[PDB]
Amino acid sequence: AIDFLVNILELIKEKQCNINLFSAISLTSIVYNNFGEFLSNNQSYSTNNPLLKYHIIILNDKNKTKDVEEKRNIFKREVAELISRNFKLDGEKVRNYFDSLKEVLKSLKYTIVDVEITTRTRALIGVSTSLGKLIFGSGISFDPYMNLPYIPASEIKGIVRSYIEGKLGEQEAEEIFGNEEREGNVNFTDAYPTRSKDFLFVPDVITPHYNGKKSEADAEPRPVIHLTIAPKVTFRFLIYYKREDVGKPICDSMPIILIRGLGARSSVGYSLFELRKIEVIKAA
Template identity: 35%
Template sequence: MSERIFDEIKRIFPDPSSINVLSWLRIRSVSYLKSRAEGKEIPEEKREILEDLFKAYSPERLREAFNRASNLLDAQKSALLSCGYDVFDFLATTTSRLIVGMASEVFGKQIFEVGLSWDPILNLPYIPGSSLKGAFRSHLERERPDLVPLLGSKSEASLVIFLDSYPVRSRYNLIVPEVTTPMYREQDGKIREVEAEPKPVFYPVINTDVTFRILIGGFLSNPPRPLMRDKGRELRNQLGQFLKEVLKKGIGAKTLVGYGLMEIP
């Protein structure tokens, strides 16, 4: 009986506009995880799941999901404005493939060994605000350390808020399969040359030419800390340029090998 149910689930095509894709992925992967636990890992099954995700996230299937994401961001923007924040609204497009949340247990890691930051309600990957703020802070620490206090500390709240960023447009399929082939694996804290063996790892990543909407709120025109007034206004005037420089260097994982590069038109 249960085998027939799983066979039926396999035939269900994930649709970002109508079903919970995270639940589909978890159920869809049950038979694969069962086989792997029994020592019968079948790479073809993993590839089939990735191919289904690739087809499901084609531009024409994403209109409703993108509209929901835009509506959420509009509501968040209105809330920030009503609280007196300056609000900065940017569109940034990926110029290379993007991986955010490799360690996340929410989406994909159990089956693909590599996670992805995922919103289970919107059925979309996203860039956490904490990732954006961390990259922004690192940039200021290198280039403008005098402005870093505006981002807060253990004793003072940040004057700047980075919201989670969602995709709102995609020229091609939003999610694409990626594969890396590590040669070595660590055992007991050591890597043994004689045990080198190529082992492909398949996992989903965000495609190039995907446009994310980035919202940043801040008390920068008239900060509540008077000593920060001139610094706040300076950051307000240069925020867009700083963000461009941050995104050109990359967001997320594997930026040193060319992933996560974005640009603001």
């Protein structure tokens, strides 16, 4: 119902790790995309909904539609700040998940290699995925049932494989990861954030001026507020296999490829990671 929508911001502020962030952002996107309408005596006349203060601020009393536009921009920034502040990491379910999965893989007689990597700068993984896409035009790869951002197993595998190509040749890359005729020997799980020092998300901006622009006459900043993954967030994922003589390349490839980027726009130093730990458990 509509009261769900008028209260979604309060619910974000008061649950902070226990609401579905995916659906929460999807719902508050309706508020963001009907902002001018949710501010015509249709705030349910509450007292905690952040929609109140946008009746108290007078940004432009001359023209009301401009006023609603500026209020909407302020509200976009405020939604970004809200999500970054309130939605924090509780990575105990993640440690439980990875420990149980490790036991499962041990029972299946796999050699497990559990890798912990910490982000060093603000990371962008899944920038074209849907999360905040309907508010920010930019997304984060988000698992809506772990209720966490994550790094897909396919990206980790692809980055490791492109490095192993660039180093040991396409033939060894196919001897490890397979081709259209043989299946790979190395399995990757998704990477989930297990611990953090502070905020899990933070706001950021990109402001292209001269992107696909003829001349300075075409120049104009178009700022893009969006969410990123805060620094010092540790992610964890597993690497399991059976054939022993495939652990050597993996071992070598992990420390290097994380220094270079792992998500989006690493060319300007965004998605850089440190190797926090690597443990190897040989099936005995």
